Give the backbone structure.
Amino acid sequence: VHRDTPENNPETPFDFTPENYKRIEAIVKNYPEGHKAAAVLPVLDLAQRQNGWLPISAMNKVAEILQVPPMRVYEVATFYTMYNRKPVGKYHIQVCTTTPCMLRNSDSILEAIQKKLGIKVGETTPDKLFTLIEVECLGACVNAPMVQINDNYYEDLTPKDIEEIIDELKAGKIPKPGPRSGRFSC
Amino acid sequence: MCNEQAYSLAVEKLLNIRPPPRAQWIRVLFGEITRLLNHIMAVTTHALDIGAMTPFFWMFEEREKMFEFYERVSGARMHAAYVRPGGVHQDLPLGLMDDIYEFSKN
Amino acid sequence: XXXXXXXXXXXXXXXXXXXXXXXXXXXXXXXXXXXXXXXXXXXXXXXXXXXXXXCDGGGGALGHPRVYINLDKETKTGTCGYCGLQFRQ
Amino acid sequence: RPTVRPRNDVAHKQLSAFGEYVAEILPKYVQQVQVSCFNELEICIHPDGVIPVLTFLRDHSNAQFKSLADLTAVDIPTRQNRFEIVYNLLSLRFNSRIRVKTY
Amino acid sequence: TQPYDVYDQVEFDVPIGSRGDCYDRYLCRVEEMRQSIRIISQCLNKMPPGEIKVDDAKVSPPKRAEMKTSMESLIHHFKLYTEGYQVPPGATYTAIEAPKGEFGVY
Amino acid sequence: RFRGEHALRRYPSGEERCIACKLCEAVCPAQAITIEAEPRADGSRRTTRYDIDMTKCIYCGFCQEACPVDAIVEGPNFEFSTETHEELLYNKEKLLNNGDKWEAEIAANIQADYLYR
Amino acid sequence: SLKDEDRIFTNLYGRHDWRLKGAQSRGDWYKTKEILLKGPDWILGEVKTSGLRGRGGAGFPTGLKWSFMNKPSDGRPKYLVVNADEGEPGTCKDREIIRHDPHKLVEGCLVGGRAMGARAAYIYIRGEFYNEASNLQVAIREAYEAGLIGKNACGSGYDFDVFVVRGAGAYICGEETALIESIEGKQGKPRLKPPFPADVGVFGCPTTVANVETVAVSPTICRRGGAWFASFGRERNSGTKLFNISGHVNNPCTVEEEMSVPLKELIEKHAGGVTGGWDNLLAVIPGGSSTPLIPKSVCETVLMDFDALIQAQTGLGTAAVIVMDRSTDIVKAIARLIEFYKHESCGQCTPCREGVDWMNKVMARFVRGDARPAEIDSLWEISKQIEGHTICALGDGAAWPVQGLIRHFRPELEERMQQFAQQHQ
Amino acid sequence: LIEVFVDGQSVMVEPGTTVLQACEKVGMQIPRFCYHERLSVAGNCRMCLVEIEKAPKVVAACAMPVMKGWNILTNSEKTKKAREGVMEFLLANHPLDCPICDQGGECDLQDQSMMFGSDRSRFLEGKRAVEDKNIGPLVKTIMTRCIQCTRCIRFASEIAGVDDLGTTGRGNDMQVGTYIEKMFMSELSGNIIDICPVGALTXXXXXXXXXXXXXXXXXXXXXXXXXXXXXXXXXXXXXXXXXXXXXXXXXXXXXX
Ligand SMILES: Cc1cc2nc3c(=O)[nH]c(=O)nc-3n(C[C@H](O)[C@H](O)[C@H](O)COP(=O)(O)O)c2cc1C
Ligand code: SF4
Ligand code: SF4
Ligand code: SF4
Ligand code: SF4
Ligand code: SF4
Ligand code: FES
Ligand code: FES
Ligand SMILES: [Zn+2]
């Protein structure tokens, strides 16, 4: 589902940021002064970072602050793939399955992550620690295995190294830009 | 089948589109089968007009067997929209080609 | 359902206190059995697994052109154009 | 083309010679407009003289039509002049079809 | 002289009398009937297996199994009625030999 | 494949097979078939007026062929004789729906219709 | 005539130590005051005389495109925007030019500011690469506070302000018109390209489309001599393009190399899987995703330059190697490429929303082998049609690689269909 | 003023004029989906793709202006290759409703297939279906029948005022609906059912009542509300049921 929006218990009750309200006003100043609807694309990402799982009522409150059409602002976040719509846990990890990564085994890393963290490849974990979702290209293709979680993307991870990093992530953060090899040249 | 033949060909000359090679051979097979109906009436009713009683019933048993070929090829007895600007409307069923040859032999 | 006059079929009124209808008196008026779409909801709804499923009356033999119906609304019944057959999940 | 085209034009060049032959006589009394399309020829004739046109095509040595078998008329209210009598002619010795019209 | 749908290839026999009397005008029709089976028999022997209607769905309606699955076929089936064929403008005259005479459709 | 008196078909699990198009109305050279449609309670939208006049109708099989859902399927009927014109012409379905007595033959005949002959 | 690889010459190579102060010592804004003092007509001529080629996946001249705007007289003030995100997979344009060395990209906007006539500079980075985008914001904050670019900095009258904005990460950074629409605030969909380019009207102003690898090359072309970049490469193609090699290889690495380099020597620098073109079956593409796969027989004659690669099948747009092994399936790999374009398609032109999705659904059957042998040739007819009748060139990106299955191959696809027909059917 | 030849014949046109707008002066209509009367010019279909005298790629009639004196052919071989092809893309993911569909003859996409579309065959396997969108009194909207264009999207924002319809997805799963469950306001949004070319939006009062055939049209002025004049009312035997807006130069701007 992408077009359909729920009406029960997630349609009227939502909160807007108050501590980051001063930072939200500064974001509009970065673009053009008159005819500023450019901040709506940036504020959608900022609201998702502060409050997890963006609601339909939260999008309506964001459109009133920037002063724009309610139908246009709701549709703007629908086209983008970066913003989450349903629900995500503390740290949501996305795996790359695209052809440059698939050539040097990407499915082997995906199968190892699916069994160690349990549950299906599409459905998220009931414990709400790691959310599994099939994604396209992330960015850095230099490392053959690539996975992006929360903010920092881990590059070059083996079949046994990926499961060990996932279990360690439950208590302590584990950035691993290059576990396999140097980032510049390998 | 001698009728609509003139009409469909006029539409075929207007649209400049040739009928399929199989449909062309069915059109002659049914174009000659109409001559078996017309030239019989050109004799039977003509002789009935003069005073001859026999030849009218000599060939109308044959003619009623002839309408079975029309009925098997299209749902109507006499007049059928079988001949169309798209060549021929419907295919010949498997129980006709064995019947036409058996009928022509006798 | 019938009131005073002959039974209604596929929503059709006979006559208000008998004024227009008079010919259908000596001869008995026709009636179709199960014409109020009572047999339409009598058939049980089929369960589905896919997001969209193609409908057919009885393959290519019986008259039914292929129509795809989406079963994702949950609250909606989900029925094809030709049939009253409902699909869930 | 296998099923696209009905027939190829080959006699059309020879039929176009007929459209020039009658036009070479050049009467304002008879000729006016000559149209030829799809293996056929169409001529329209001035109302004042139709009988001298009908004596032509008949008997003539180069074009021996003679048989003036079919005779039609068009009903149309678009033009200032309403009806249009259309003659359909056929030759038995020459084997060709030509059309005569009134305006 | 003027072929319609695969002619000259089929051997035709034309009965022509001497006097313009009713007896000779009767004999030619009976001689047409005796020399009609030859056309039917040649039509039975020469049959190419293939298509019944033209492949163009703009002129001839598609098959029943064809329209139920594919999209384009059903729309052309829908549009071949109400406002059907769409004919190219221009006056045309065709005549195919009837057993009585000619059908001069204009 | 033979055409006689008109009768409209139905699906194996109830329901009217006719969808109401005005398609068969346009093909009809006699214009014997009349059709007017209103929504059936809720959801389905299938017919209200459906008269096929036997005062006209040349029996083409056109409406049998033009119908996408195969509602009008022509049965091998012969017996039809009336006192008046009113008894002859078919009413709003009903008598046409009473083609159930011929629908058993229709189901056998249509088995020769799909993948034609 | 033959070109040698690099040989101690690079536009941007620093990755070991660079931040702000460390970068300045190692060639950064060396002639910043010299370039600012020079006129806009002479600075635009500096790029045109050298003959710089477009680093982004388009195949357009960089000198011609930058001078296309020119700005003789304008009511609304002009602004130039540079794309930092990577569209096509198998490209290290965002991981190296934005993450490793942000000082080169930040100086590039200031270098093409006074010459192009831009009031403000904008950057659009990838949504997934948040850590990489944060490094660009940190370098911009260090430059503005100290006094490198803005208001009256670097000894120039014309003001230029740099701002970084996060993108969606799909087709938003794809097309030239798409970058203007994404920065404006509207949904990620490219504008109509035929009547007006970026120069005529883009986000209420005259604009110019720039790539991350193209904008970073502009200070390198201005500070160093024009003949230094013109010498390396071919007759038509000039400069140096960074090529990223990843896939079936002993060690995958992205490294800068000179133009018109042979494929046999470029793959040898990173060392491929088992053998380059002797034992392992070659199926490597010259581009990222825009270019179709190259055959094993024709690989030595093909060059990295855009002029030479156009003769053999299709020219490399992204210009990056994606090596494939003999053990890896060819049909399964290209099916994923079209599957990428199924999700990246914006949803405007009808032969792309219901075209690419139609192509991918048929291509899924080819892996199984249920498809007819006649269906291969019919697939080629539809795929060619999308290339011509689309507003943006992302539809072309789902058209070129599919043509690379019909070309060169064909018995490989037929063998998969024939095997399933005899075993299952 | 600058003259440019269209199908060899030269016609006078303004300096800023569309290719489809200029072709109408020479009495030639190209296949259209995105309007030229009052709605804003937009791509998002590429049906009106026409080839110039010297061009490597075909250009859209809505987007590309004439500008310079260049020849453009309407009945060209290159133009026919596009029109016969783009139709196949439109019908690859089309739900098939033609008999059940509320429109039948009035549908613009239905007519274009008969005149320009490829008749011989259609290759397709599995068409995607969209969920039904919420609508109040007028125009019962079916999202499946919609071709996903930009006509009603711009109509809500410009002509109607308050925006409601827009883009929802990215690929074939993208819907033209409101996304949030909310009923559309009246004002002038009743004309949106008459605006859409396909049988996607059609009035609930006139749904499954009468087809385009058999109904006879007659022009009459509107009685309810002043200024509004000229509206076609279908007779369809005895009692009228379908009402449609008739085109007017100054009286009404293609909306009742
Ligand atoms: C499918 C597709 C995706 C593209 N993605 C990008 C991208 O992410 N970043 C970029 O700078 N250019 C991208 N381009 C190239 C653009 O056309 C670019 O705006 C420009 O034309 C390249 O020329 P330049 O290097 O002179 O700016 C893409 C092109 C296509 C066809
Ligand atoms: S009989 Fe068939 S064609 Fe006629 S209205 Fe009913 S469904 Fe439509
Ligand atoms: S058989 Fe012919 S005349 Fe009779 S109802 Fe059908 S279409 Fe009309
Ligand atoms: S070609 Fe595809 S991605 Fe590009 S603008 Fe058109 S619909 Fe969007
Ligand atoms: S939208 Fe048009 S073409 Fe499609 S089913 Fe409805 S009437 Fe037919
Ligand atoms: S509902 Fe009609 S006008 Fe609106 S997008 Fe769909 S096809 Fe276009
Ligand atoms: S293709 Fe996997 S990270 Fe780019
Ligand atoms: S009709 Fe011109 S772009 Fe759609
Ligand atoms: Zn059904």
